[PDB]
User: Which sequence fits this backbone?
DNA sequence: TGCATTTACGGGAAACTG
DNA sequence: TGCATTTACGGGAAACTG
């Protein structure tokens, strides 16, 4: 809450206060050297027409006061550095991690307003300290003498003030929204050669003499040593309009921003790399956008510069799945050190950290993430029976390496289930009708429940296209549980034709010449089908109407 | 058969024969002026060391023989013109119509070999007649005299021979295969901005001193006055490599050809036309490819030139349907006169001519066209109860203008039915299982047939997506026909999910608590379902198998 | 020879301009 | 304001190159 923000805030007032205060002192000193000027100039020349002593004791004040002014700036400057350290190395830093996490889903990041505020106040305050060092520069360029407080102090001061300004502005230039294809908005750090994508820069030092002044140019792979060292490294060029100029309009509430839309990548086919497909890493190489600009002024010439988070580049949305797998692993095990050679030695993740991201994956796309018992199932797929919250899942295991006995990788498996929910199960998923992930051993051991006529909804473990199922329980006459019963899993092909509610409503089980049955009374504990799936059912010389319907035996 | 071909052929021998024959005569004359030369030259100068008369009577022969030579070429030339008329204005002409018809489906066109033959023989023969006019040019450039048969004849002859050659070669240059997108091979005169398409030129005068000599360049809309006169006329540019050179290799069996692949159109967005969408004609404007080249030689400089059939240009295969509608109507009511302003006043077609094309539409895509009773149904849709084979179907009626009461045009309706067969009904269509087109009045009046358990397959008349149905007959107890019965039509959406054979195999009709029925015993006259659709049916701790199935009530 | 990655095109939907 | 035509992108399959 206001744990730091209050502290921090406090300090920024402190600066602002000190700067005014200098500013009186400068006036009063701007007076007293005049007053002297007047009285001296009438008294130096005088005889052209009871002690006292004005000239000897009073002069003193043209010393005293200047000393007090000079020493007093120095105190301000020293403070300002403390402040500026707190604000650049904690405050901003923290926001940027917070944003890293927003990208792979996770708690949404706060606005850049509060920050923009501090940054701008401390950046105004310096600017004022700039001018007074020039007003004192003036007084010296009136009157000077043996030891002139403002002749020893002049250059060190000037140099500090600018040193400070420079660090300050440099740090403000920041990627307010990282690169993204519009047609893929939950998937923001993967690009495809061809499609257009958007970036937003933003400066935090909202002055008004920086309006239509800064011209940002975009670059790509600039200074990436992995072009020479890594065999097979692709190369590209940005197509759209790069240069934009950064302006207060457009984005509301000030914000001195620049929102590129219409940017594109194209590969640089030049043989060259010769696309060695026997190299170090598949297309999970990371590549980096860069932005550049420069703040030109009377006596000022600041180069700015920054960098998106590492990006992945693909050709075909076929790849996107595996592509997002790489952006997860990096924005989860890396603080920012742009480690474009990360996948050469990709470290292991702890189960405790994995799980909360796996959850984020569903919470972002739907309206409900992965509960506890669910997670324990995927726990055990990766980790074994002993699924401690410390266990280490290696990057092979999560992504390129078949599960226990199957012909697919684990991440590809979830990725499909996730795609199925998105386009055929949202309503049932939002509303908690689906258990989804549950072992076919704890699923029996929870169906010695009730009325021979209860059924769960699972996700097939054996598919690759991602596929829902259902299981129910009978009475076998032996005085015990049934073998229980599950139907071959409904994938997209069936589901496209009739809905999964409609399937359930009307399933039959048939014979030769027997009235056909309907063995689905109860959803999980006790819910009568036509209440659980009530609201999702569709609808309730003269063609006769038909329905599709799924049937067994 | 060999009705003309024999005649024609005959004549071409005639030419070839005459040319040899000249050729002896030229030799024997090439001798007799020598012989004279020898005897004269010994006798002119003689005294430097019984009558007779050699010099006076014999000389005569240097006249006689030359006269006979000269007159004799003239006979050849005169003949050759007759031949060349027959071959250019009937023979070629006919082939080209034959090809026009191949494009909208129809009897496949013969090879260009036979033609290539004639063309080449008559084109060799001239070439020889070229040379002898130069061998006689020589004899004159030996010896001459009062009336020299070959001084009056020299220029007229020379000029004729070339006049002839020129017409001959000009006519050979011909579009052996008209433009087409590979991904759309039954639809060859419609192009889409973006896709690549192919053309083949071919010359018919297969000489060997025209190999890597002729460089064909492609053009587009060249000399099309409908760019200035017609408001809204689009414009374009060919992208790929235009110039190709025409070579004997590549295409086997000689053939001096040039097969462009990789050609593309792009619109010329330049405002300009300003895309007035209140002009004369929708995108059914016709546009024309042109080919050009030039046959450069010692003393010869022939410009060649030709033109594809009019083409239609679209943006999106959405349009292709209506697009093909325009290519049908033109290659059916127009002999070739490139009437790019045809759709401004589009004439009416007679039912007799329509029908055979409508048939061609199915015969081309499947393996069976439209029988007689079928045609009579579409007869009556367009024409009325009185569907004479002379009735006039106007172009509105066939294409842009709703049917009697419906919300679609007739051609769009067939176009859909046609698309349905192509991707879900081929086998049943090939094998005559489907009546398809039959009025819902003659369909009752042919189902007071038999065992309450017969059913046809129709095509819905009310769809727009194109949709099959089935109807069957009962027994009502009243001692007469049933109301009969038809199911709401199965379109692509159902059909994609389960097949139309599988539908039929298992349809049920259901109740609350009654065993469900199967009212489809017999296909049309008497065929037991499971024989008619026998061969098309699919197939005949442990998931339990299901099926989709269509059900009524 | 096989697998990985990229291209090319169809179809659907949104965007554009008259 | 509405309709026609074109663009932009996803997904599937073929083509390419190591």
Assistant:
């Amino acid at each position: 809450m206001l744990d730091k923000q209050k502290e921090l805030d406090s300090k920024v007032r402190n600066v602002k206060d000190k700067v005014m205060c200098i500013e009186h002192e400068i006036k009063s000193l701007e007076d007293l050297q005049d007053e002297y000027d007047f009285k001296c100039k009438t008294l130096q020349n005088r005889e052209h027409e009871q002690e006292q002593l004005l000239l000897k004791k009073m002069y003193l004040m043209l010393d005293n006061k200047r000393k007090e002014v000079v020493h007093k700036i120095i105190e301000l400057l020293n403070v300002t550095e403390l402040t500026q350290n707190a604000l650049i190395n904690d405050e901003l830093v923290e926001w940027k991690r917070r944003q890293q996490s927003a990208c792979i889903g996770g708690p949404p990041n706060a606005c850049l307003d509060q920050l923009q505020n501090w940054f701008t106040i401390v950046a105004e305050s310096l600017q004022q300290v700039r001018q007074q060092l020039k007003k004192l520069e003036e007084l010296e360029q009136k009157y000077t003498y043996e030891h002139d407080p403002i002749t020893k102090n002049k250059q060190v001061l000037w140099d500090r003030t600018f040193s400070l300004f420079q660090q300050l502005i440099q740090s403000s230039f920041v990627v307010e929204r990282q690169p993204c294809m519009p047609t893929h908005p939950q998937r923001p750090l993967v690009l495809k050669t061809g499609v257009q994508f958007t970036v937003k820069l933003r400066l935090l030092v909202k002055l008004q003499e920086l309006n239509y002044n800064l011209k940002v140019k975009v670059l790509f792979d600039k200074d990436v040593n992995e072009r020479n060292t890594v065999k097979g490294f692709r190369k590209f060029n940005i197509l759209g309009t790069h240069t934009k100029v950064m302006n207060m309009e457009e984005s509301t509430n000030g914000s001195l921003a620049a929102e590129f839309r219409h940017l594109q990548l194209k590969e640089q086919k030049n043989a060259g790399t010769r696309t060695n497909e026997g190299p170090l890493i598949v297309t999970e190489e990371l590549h980096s956008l860069s932005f550049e600009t420069q703040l030109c002024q009377p006596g000022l010439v600041i180069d700015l510069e920054t960098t998106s988070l590492p990006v992945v580049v693909i050709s075909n949305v076929s790849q996107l799945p595996s592509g997002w797998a790489s952006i997860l692993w990096y924005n989860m095990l890396v603080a920012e050190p742009r480690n474009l050679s990360f996948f050469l030695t990709p470290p292991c993740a702890r189960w405790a950290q994995l799980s909360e991201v796996l959850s984020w994956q569903f919470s972002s796309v739907t309206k409900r993430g992965l509960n506890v018992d669910q997670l324990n199932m995927l726990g055990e797929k990766l980790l074994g029976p002993n699924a401690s919250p410390d266990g280490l899942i290696p990057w092979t295991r999560f992504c390129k390496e078949n599960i226990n006995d199957k012909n697919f990788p684990f991440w590809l498996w979830i990725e499909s289930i996730l795609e199925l929910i998105k386009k055929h199960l949202l309503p049932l998923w939002n509303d908690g009708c689906i258990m989804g992930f549950i072992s076919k051993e704890r699923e029996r051991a929870l169906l010695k429940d009730q009325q021979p006529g209860t059924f769960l909804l699972r996700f097939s473990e054996s598919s690759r296209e991602g596929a829902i199922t259902f299981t129910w329980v009978e009475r076998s006459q032996n005085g015990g549980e049934p073998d229980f019963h599950a139907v071959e899993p409904y994938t997209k092909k069936e589901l496209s034709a009739v809905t999964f509610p409609d399937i359930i409503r009307n399933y039959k089980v048939m014979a030769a010449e027997n009235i056909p049955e309907n063995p689905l009374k109860y959803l999980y504990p006790n819910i009568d089908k036509d209440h659980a799936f009530g609201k999702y059912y569709s609808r309730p010389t003269g063609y006769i109407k038909t329905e599709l319907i799924s049937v067994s035996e």
Notes: Chain B touches chain A through 30 residues (CB under 8 Å). The CA atoms of residues 23 and 349 of chain B lie 56 Å apart.
